[PDB]
Amino acid sequence: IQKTPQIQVYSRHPPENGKPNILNCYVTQFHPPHIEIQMLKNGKKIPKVEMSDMSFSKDWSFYILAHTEFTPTETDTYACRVKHDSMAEPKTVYWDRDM
Amino acid sequence: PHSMRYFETAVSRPGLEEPRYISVGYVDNKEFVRFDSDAENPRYEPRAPWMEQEGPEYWERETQKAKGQEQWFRVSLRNLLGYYNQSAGGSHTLQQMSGCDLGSDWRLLRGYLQFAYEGRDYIALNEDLKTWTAADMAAQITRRKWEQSGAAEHYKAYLEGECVEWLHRYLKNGNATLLRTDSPKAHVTHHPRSKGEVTLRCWALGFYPADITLTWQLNGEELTQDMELVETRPAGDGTFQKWASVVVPLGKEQNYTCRVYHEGLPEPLTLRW
Amino acid sequence: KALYNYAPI
Predict the structure, then answer these.
(1) What domains lie within chain A, and their CATH numbers?
(2) Which of A6, B20, B54, B239 is such that its CA lies 20 to 30 A from the CA of B119?
């Protein structure tokens, strides 16, 4: 009875090392609406992450947009880790700047 | 062309006491009000600047409608447990979508009123606003009950009356905010690759509303099979982003063109590397 | 304008 979440991690503006930006973790297509979304810098949980309010699409499925301030570098990896009943394990997806 | 929607939800959870009820209203697909039972002083709150025009008498009434719906969902959730012979100790969801569609003549184009349980279609009002559609054997009890009560006439009245009339009122009140469409700004990026191949990624940025189509062409005809794309995604600022890519022989890249179809555009965009 | 429902499910 559960739909499994689709995830995209991407910045708001074109990424540029050293210049401040925002990082989005856009989680869609899930059910039930209870979920845990974390955003990570180099493996560690990013402390102050913003979370849009529970919304659902016309197909009945739920989506959420999570975002945080960040300044990308050549070397620091960012990632989004989602935890949800449709998944035995949490899913991590890493930020690719070319996507 | 215009619309209004209220997207209502109630969820129960194991052990807890009362379901959580959230309602969200949309005009032309943008959020404009919200109610949430978890809040400290549960109320319908404005959710765009243009709605702050509305006085106290408006919020009070809308707020009591929400509390009423909360109670409606509460009972419904309970009955549904029974209908599906679900025991205690699980999590359940009941959702509703309702509203109306107007053509550019501002006349009622279509009414909507549908319900889902556990994210699956449960019952819906047909387009005629007179007859009901319900697949599940468990839903038939509701559909018979509703067929014999004139539930459809009640909902028909709302959708043809207040929905329309009040959407009218809202549209006048927020002309400067809700008449906009941001056009996409597009560009093609180059990603070298294995086997004398490259990836051509066609970007579209800062556009609203979200619907958009990106197509690649090999000097004429489209490329449906070989293409890669992402689901359209919010930028966080109210605009949207999408790309689409294809794999291409190095050097032989200029005979690929990317086309961007967005509303709000004078004509489709055409770009290469 | 919020809808109000008729009979419960």
Answers:
(1) 1-99 (2.60.40.10)
(2) B239
Distance from CA of B205 to the nearest CA of A (A): 9
- The burial of B182, by beta-carbon neighbours within 10 Å (0-12 exposed, 13-18 middle, 19 or more buried), is given as middle
Exposure b/e, B126-159, CB count within 10 A at least 16 = b: eeebeebebebeebeebbeebeeeebbebbbebb
Query: Please, are residues B204 and B229 in contact by the beta-carbon 8 Å criterion?
Result: no
* Straight-line distance from the first to the last Cα atom of chain A, in angstroms, rounded to the nearest whole number: 32
Q: What technique was this entry resolved by?
A: X-ray
B23 interface with C at CB cutoff 8 Å: yes
Contact B206, B182 (CB under 8 A): yes
Interface touch B24/A34, C-beta < 8 Å: no
The gap from C-alpha B63 to its chain's centroid, in whole angstroms, comes to: 22
Mutate one of B29, B86, B98, B241 to test the A interface: name it (highest A CB count within 10 A). B241
> B181-271: which CATH architecture?
Sandwich (2.60)
**Closest residue of A to B23, CA-based?**
A55
Say whether C7 and B79 touch across the interface (CB within 8 A): no
A33 contacts B9? CB cut-off 8 A: yes
Q: Do A10 and B116 touch (CB under 8 A)?
A: no
Distances (CA, A) of B60 to A65, B45, B140: 30, 11, 36
Place of tokens 């708001």: A12
Residues of chain B within CATH 2.60.40.10 domain(s) are 181-271
